[PDB]
DNA sequence: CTCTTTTTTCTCG
DNA sequence: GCGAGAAACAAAGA
């Protein structure tokens with residue numbers, strides 16, 4: 001999941017578990033709780049969920065006044081709300097039980113993580129990760145963006161994926177964004193001219209906000225997304241580009257599968 | 268059978 | 281510092 005999917009999950013959860021007292025917490029895979037499962041179980045049991053926030057691709061459960069549970073879904077994490085008598089499925093790892101249902105985390109690849117941290121440590125947590133601004137007009141300052149691009153000789157796609165120029169892009173939306181901004185994924189950032197950086201900036205915001213409105217891409221909470229029907233290049237190798245009669249090509253860039261339209265995305 | 272494919276952190280040179 | 285490659289892991293396809 002990328003920012004749009006995580007935000008969809010955040011919204012569904014917010015409407016359903018906020019106000020719910022945690023009756024108990026159980027784990028078949030305690031190892032994904034990086035700060036210690038027993039400590040998390042002791043601290044959160046009996047607490048009421050106050051809210052759910054999000055920063056980049058990170059889910060943030062506000063639980064009691066003084067704790068936050070930072071959940072990352074990584075590649076295939078999935079939450080669902082189930083009745084208490086629901087049967088365990090093979091890749092279920094954690095469950096948070098309420099009086100009238102339960103929140104189950106499942107993750108085939110076991111990459112997802114939970115971290116318990118205190119409220120006044122949330123901002124420091126994200127500062128230490130150097131997570132960039134949220135992809136909104138109010139937060140994503142183009143001027144700083146522009147100066148960071150001009151100082152680097154990194155390729156634009158992997159640099160955007162680092163989450164430090166701006167938060168929330170992953171492989172799908174970085175490919176869509178670069179297609180929309182007519183930029184080559186291996187373009188070195190210091191060769192980007194001002195007008196391209198401007199288009200890149202706005203496209204990042206516009207694509208991510210559109211995907212949020214369409215409830216994310218779906219290829220469980222957040223499983224009713226429609227953004228996948230609007231994808232222009234990701235996973236569409238060999239099919240025609242929607243800007244010219246060329247075909248989508250797929251290459252490897254700094255380890256990632258990369259879909260782009262050669263003719264519309266020259267350096 | 269082998270090899271490759273699908274977020275973030277770590278290692279090595 | 282850097283970039284490349286691999287690692288965490290499971291399942292599927294070639």
Ligand SMILES: O=c1[nH]c(=S)[nH]c2[nH]ccc12
Pocket residue numbers: 158161162163169170171274275
């Ligand atoms: O290289 C990265 N690619 C993605 S998708 N997320 C990241 N976080 C930190 C580094 C990276």
